[PDB]
């Protein structure tokens, strides 16, 4: 094969309107390579292509498949990462190595998702946000360690040619970015994010770099919310299907429990999702489209919510 150009996957691959979940699963590894190519990482870092193929195949293979926290989730978060690169022009904000770390983090950040819901930090703001949230910041996870175990598998070391210093910096970035997916982490840095958007992003501030990378990471994880109505509806279904994945009903109870979805999804939008994409828009005028679209989904949910 060799790598496909992004524009050959779909004329709209690079548009916020595009739904990556509609790519057949078998074409997703190739589409990862297409995106790294169009982002100029393969060329600039002179990455061996067979190696990058094996790496990508290896992380895909390492995902469990619950209804929601699965490869397609990872794939679609990665794809949003690419959309932020293309549409917000992140190279004017972050360094190449940070963008690269962000992308690989998207690919890797749910490898050790367990679904053990053991915390009240997110739940206090939104009961459904707690089910969408990745884990690792309150209970220890090994999304990161698993990513490296892959990296150190013969024939998979895509950062082989980096300097020792960039190699540590790459690993530190992944470890920190993967941790930041956990919404408990986001809540804990929220005031800092707010301060950053108030004062204005400062390319020379290393703190601003760290904060932006977390914000972007969480913006990719919840990016299902920035798609069509059908997408939040389908994703809400999946989260449910996951959490009920095993206990004697007192069919019936299942339906009472899905009658709660609208209000939970609205509370999730109002208290967690929308603030995040408000922040992006405050920092990036070109992200207005995204907040508007989440806003519009909150409207449909409200509208539906009188089942
Ligand atoms: Zn995730």
From Swiss-Prot:
What changing residue 240 to A does, per the record, is: Decreased 3',5'-cyclic-AMP phosphodiesterase activity. Loss of 3',5'-cyclic-GMP phosphodiesterase activity
State which gene encodes it.
PDE2A
The reported result of mutating residue 264 to M is:
Decreased 3',5'-cyclic-AMP phosphodiesterase activity. Decreased 3',5'-cyclic-GMP phosphodiesterase activity
Record the organism: Homo sapiens (Human)
Q: Partners and quaternary state?
A: Homodimer.
This one is known as cGMP-dependent 3',5'-cyclic phosphodiesterase
The record's disulfide annotation reads none
Q: Which residues bind Zn(2+)?
A: 73, 109-110, 221
Boundaries of the shown chain within the full protein: 588 to 901 of 941
Q: Name the domain of life this protein comes from.
A: Eukaryota
